[PDB]
Amino acid sequence: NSVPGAPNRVSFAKLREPLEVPGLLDVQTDSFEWLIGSPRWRESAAERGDVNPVGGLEEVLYELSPIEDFSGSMSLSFSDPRFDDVKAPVDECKDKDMTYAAPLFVTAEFINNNTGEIKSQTVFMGDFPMMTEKGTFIINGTERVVVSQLVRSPGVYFDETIDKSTDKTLHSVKVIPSRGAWLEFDVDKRDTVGVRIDRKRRQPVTVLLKALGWTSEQIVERFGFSEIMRSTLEKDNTVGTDEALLDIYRKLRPGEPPTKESAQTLLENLFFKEKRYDLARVGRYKVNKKLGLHVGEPITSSTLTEEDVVATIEYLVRLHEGQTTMTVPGGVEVPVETDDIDHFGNRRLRTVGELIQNQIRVGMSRMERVVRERMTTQDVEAITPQTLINIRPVVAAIKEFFGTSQLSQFMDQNNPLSGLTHKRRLSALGPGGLSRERAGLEVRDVHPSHYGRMCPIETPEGPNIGLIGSLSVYARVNPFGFIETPYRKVVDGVVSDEIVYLTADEEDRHVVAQANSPIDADGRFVEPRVLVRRKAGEVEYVPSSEVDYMDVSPRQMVSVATAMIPFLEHDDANRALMGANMQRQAVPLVRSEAPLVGTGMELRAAIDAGDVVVAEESGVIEEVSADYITVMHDNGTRRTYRMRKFARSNHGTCANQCPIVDAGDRVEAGQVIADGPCTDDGEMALGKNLLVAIMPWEGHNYEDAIILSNRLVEEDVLTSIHIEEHEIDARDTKLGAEEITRDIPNISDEVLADLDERGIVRIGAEVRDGDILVGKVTPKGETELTPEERLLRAIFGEKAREVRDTSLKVPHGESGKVIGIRVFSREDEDELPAGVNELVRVYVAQKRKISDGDKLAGRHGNKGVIGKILPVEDMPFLADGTPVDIILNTHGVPRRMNIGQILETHLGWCAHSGWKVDAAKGVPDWAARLPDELLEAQPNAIVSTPVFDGAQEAELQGLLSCTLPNRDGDVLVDADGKAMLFDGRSGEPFPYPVTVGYMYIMKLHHLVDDKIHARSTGPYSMITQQPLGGKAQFGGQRFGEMECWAMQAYGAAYTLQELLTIKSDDTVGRVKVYEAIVKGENIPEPGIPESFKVLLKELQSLCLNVEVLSS
């Protein structure tokens, strides 16, 4: 709905969602254009936050502006950041391995104080990478995405603990700011108040308070009610600002002469001279709200105010006093609480914009250091910002960020959804966050503030559960970086349509209703007792007068990928989590059938994932061809959209884009104009609608295994194209030059047949494991030839041609056609890395079909490998003769608590055969609440159940009992949802009816051909002489410690000796074993390994005489 060419997909939504789904890639695009200062963000600020522009780069330049020397005679202020046009379009950068960037121009200005000048220029600062339209950076030629990170927001954290030795509440504060220092005001076991400043041996308050300009009389003046502070005043043990600050300098700076002026200046230097202390905009707003110091005052002065220090002390001592609220003079009062390190009022989103700003700052500070050092060395009346600015540091910083960083990951793009979900990802395990070992187990739980700001379902199921999540559907990131959330404002018991966004703090302040509540078509609630959420996550039945906010819609708590699971509310959270994590692993099939039963998020997840061409402005198509669509935009202009037929993804999968329009169709702006890899008419389609029956059949579908018809293989229903890339470089060598040439030393003309002339294969040659994709010959020089080899060479008339062969050969088990060959060479001026005269990449590709061991899964977590692909005749067929296509198992359904698949099954059948609500006697109560034009449906008619307002079970029962017959008079599936299957193998009918239906299942990217592996003898490691590791090489499987225990427990000594001596390390023993096997002799007695001789020489190298004496 609301998309011009929308598949007419009838929804079961009883409710009516007011707000549209937002610009699902705004968390990336808006952040980046905030960094730049695009006119888009300028107008967005004009709307909301028009106080002033902060252009990211701009803020960095202003804060740095100016670079003043110590003598204060010369100043430099780089200012006014500017961007040129991208050096190259996207596709060219992606093909030629260029980073998609654009230059930075900045007006530098150098000013001499004593004589008086300004030296203004336009300094090239560096080639800055640019976000594409899809929210990705093409850095280095790949497609990297910067994942948003969650980190603790700067601010004041008032927290308290208990002391089991005393049983007293001990309150405390920390003000951890950006680029500043740590400070702690604590209340200890006694009734005193430690003021530990910068990590070293506590302090009583009075020292600072006098050093802060507050006399003991003033201390009483403000802290009179504070009996604890009054007691600490009695305990002060010291009085006087000068003496107190002097003792400060003496202690905090241990042993430093406590001269007054250095101490006075040090107080500022650490806390008020902002060059060594800067709590940022985010922290400043946070603390302002906490202490309520200011409201309409612009967010500025990003440095500490002592006014806030004394307010912190007062708030802390009143918190220990047990007060409810506190009024600070000069500000509106605030309530008195503690803070948590999960509540999203204390964890913020350092989006891509802020991360790049921080890295640019790390660059700019180095630049400033170098600039000022050189300025001091440079002679005056001769220099200019061109001669001062070194732009190496900024380029180095940006490069080391985008490349070689934890938070800039290859966009996992198996299916479009995996793309749109690798964006919108929240990752707490980043530089500046926490490691997977320092991860407090309290950071992975779903604190009740996550509702509407982070999906509780979707997280990786590995050792990352909770550290990586994904944003909600409707979430929106505050300028400061706090995850806002839309709610509906209910006033005077009247629900309005004025959507208002709230952060977690105002979520705690106010009280929130539910969207599935009886609104009486006027904004009015119906029943007074209403479900509602209180501050601490509590759930309560408030009378319907104190509700001031209501949820915008159901399925607000949930991510993008999980919102695509029909009947989610029936599935358990474990299997729904699995379903969401495997809905991103489907592969693009060759046919891409839309799901028969789905949610509303199949269309909005494709038109916003970027893998579907979109008609920019209305027009009429003229030339629709498999490569280009020409649209005639009404007012004169024409535009040719170009496809990407058979383009390799970042995980080897196809990326075709075929058009869906005809030469006479009229299109509107924002319409789907061409499907992508996984799409059909614009609706995300990751798999196929396969007929499924739920009997356990002959033990082949035993313990999650799945059987298939041979129809799926034959008719190419499940079939994924995989395009693999191979690459050989003609690097220079000392002995000579490696030449990619057809001729190769021993290679005969038979194998050579494929190679054309340059050395590359011809587009289309069916290569198989061992073929010569690229023929490259490397100089070797003269080496001795064994007498025997010389004899053979002469007898058979073959000379040496010392130049040795190192041609590229297709890896084991990587057959297929050669889609295309790309040759980069230095002669063509291609900018290959130094030493590479030629780098050729060959794109082989295979049409992998479904196979025993391939992993298939539904949308409900019900994964499983393919146990056996049965022929079509030994498959339980219906009374109509139609065979079922897969057969799941029954025992996996009840104990995994995911009966969603069953409901999806039944509804699926209903949607295939089409129903006709028997409303001749009026609409039955079963459909009394069902929308119109659902009273009847057509065969193969598409339906949708939104997530949390889907098909009430009663609706499914009635629909299942109201299906129309196929072609004869034959209702194959009775009211119960089951059918009488005939055994295709034996012949007799099954004695009990069986559940059948149409379930939408996917093909996961865990194919067997990527997993099967074998080694008899292959490469060997270097330092130690073990077999190597991984499928890229041959390698073996780690016969680890636990397996050694297992075979010690059996008592198998000879096998253990084998596997640890003459299969891994016994260097002289391996060749003897191979020779004895070939000659057919007893396998030789094993020897000492090569890990009890390296040890011996190390111990005779650490000067510990380790010796072996039998006696």
Q: Contact positions toward another protein, by CB under 8 A?
A: 442, 445-447, 890-891, 894-895, 897, 899, 902-903, 906, 953, 956-957, 975-978
Nearer to another protein, 453 or 644 (CB): 453
Nearer to another protein, 490 or 577 (CB): 577
- Cβ-Cβ contacts under 8 Å for 78 (sequence gap 6 or more): 61, 64, 65, 106, 107, 108, 109, 123, 125, 385, 389
End-to-end Cα spacing for the chain: 89
* Nearest approach, Cβ of residue 284 and another protein (Å): 31
Nearer to another protein, 417 or 911 (CB): 911
CB of 885 closer than 8 Å to CB of 691 = yes
Letter string b/e over residues 1020-1035, b meaning 16 or more CB atoms within 10 A of that residue's CB:
beeeebbbeeeeeebb
Residue 458 to residue 447: CA distance in whole angstroms? 15
* Nearest approach, Cβ of residue 905 and another protein (Å): 9
Nearer to another protein, 509 or 891 (CB): 891
* Nearest approach, Cβ of residue 301 and another protein (Å): 38
With H, G, I as helix, E, B as strand and everything else as coil, classify residue 898: coil
Nearer to another protein, 455 or 601 (CB): 455
- 456 to each of 23, 527, 538, 861, 966, how far by Cα in Å? 21, 30, 17, 16, 42
* Nearest approach, Cβ of residue 942 and another protein (Å): 22
Residue 112 to residue 73: CA distance in whole angstroms? 6
Nearer to another protein, 823 or 897 (CB): 897
Q: What's the one-letter identity of residue 32?
A: F
DSSP 948: T
The DSSP-derived string for 557-572 is SS-SSGGG-TTGGGS-
CB of 727 closer than 8 Å to CB of 839 = yes
Nearer to another protein, 696 or 745 (CB): 696
CB of 207 closer than 8 Å to CB of 249 = no
* Nearest approach, Cβ of residue 862 and another protein (Å): 15
Residue 179 to residue 672: CA distance in whole angstroms? 47
Nearer to another protein, 572 or 627 (CB): 572
* Nearest approach, Cβ of residue 538 and another protein (Å): 11
Residue 410 to residue 418: CA distance in whole angstroms? 12
* Nearest approach, Cβ of residue 959 and another protein (Å): 12
Residue 165 to residue 152: CA distance in whole angstroms? 31
Nearer to another protein, 353 or 950 (CB): 950
* Nearest approach, Cβ of residue 971 and another protein (Å): 15
3-state SS, 133-192, equals CCCCECCCCCCEEECEEEEECCCCEEEEEECCCCCCEEEEEECCCCCCCCEEEECCCCCC
CB of 486 closer than 8 Å to CB of 501 = yes
* Nearest approach, Cβ of residue 468 and another protein (Å): 18
Rg (CA), the chain: 36
- Which of 362, 353, 398, 481 minimizes the C-alpha distance to 37? 353
* Nearest approach, Cβ of residue 482 and another protein (Å): 22
* Nearest approach, Cβ of residue 977 and another protein (Å): 6
Nearer to another protein, 811 or 993 (CB): 993
With H, G, I as helix, E, B as strand and everything else as coil, classify residue 285: helix
- Residues 1056, 1062, 1064: CA angle, nearest 5 degrees: 85
Nearer to another protein, 256 or 445 (CB): 445
Nearer to another protein, 160 or 756 (CB): 160
- Which of 657, 658, 662, 660 minimizes the C-alpha distance to 623? 662
CB of 592 closer than 8 Å to CB of 675 = yes
Nearer to another protein, 984 or 993 (CB): 993
- 284 to each of 1, 173, 351, 440, 1016, how far by Cα in Å? 43, 16, 18, 27, 65
* Nearest approach, Cβ of residue 456 and another protein (Å): 11
Q: What's the one-letter identity of residue 65?
A: S
Nearer to another protein, 975 or 1077 (CB): 975
* Nearest approach, Cβ of residue 960 and another protein (Å): 8
Both tokens of residue 1035? 């390698």
Q: What's the one-letter identity of residue 184?
A: E
* Nearest approach, Cβ of residue 856 and another protein (Å): 22
Letter string b/e over residues 832-865, b meaning 16 or more CB atoms within 10 A of that residue's CB:
beeebbbbbbbbbbbebbbeeebbbbbbbbbbbb
Nearer to another protein, 423 or 575 (CB): 575
* Nearest approach, Cβ of residue 923 and another protein (Å): 22
Alpha helices in 296-412 (DSSP H): 306-321, 352-377, 385-388, 392-402
Nearer to another protein, 744 or 903 (CB): 903
Residue 530 to residue 509: CA distance in whole angstroms? 18
* Nearest approach, Cβ of residue 895 and another protein (Å): 4
Alpha helices in 766-899 (DSSP H): 787-795
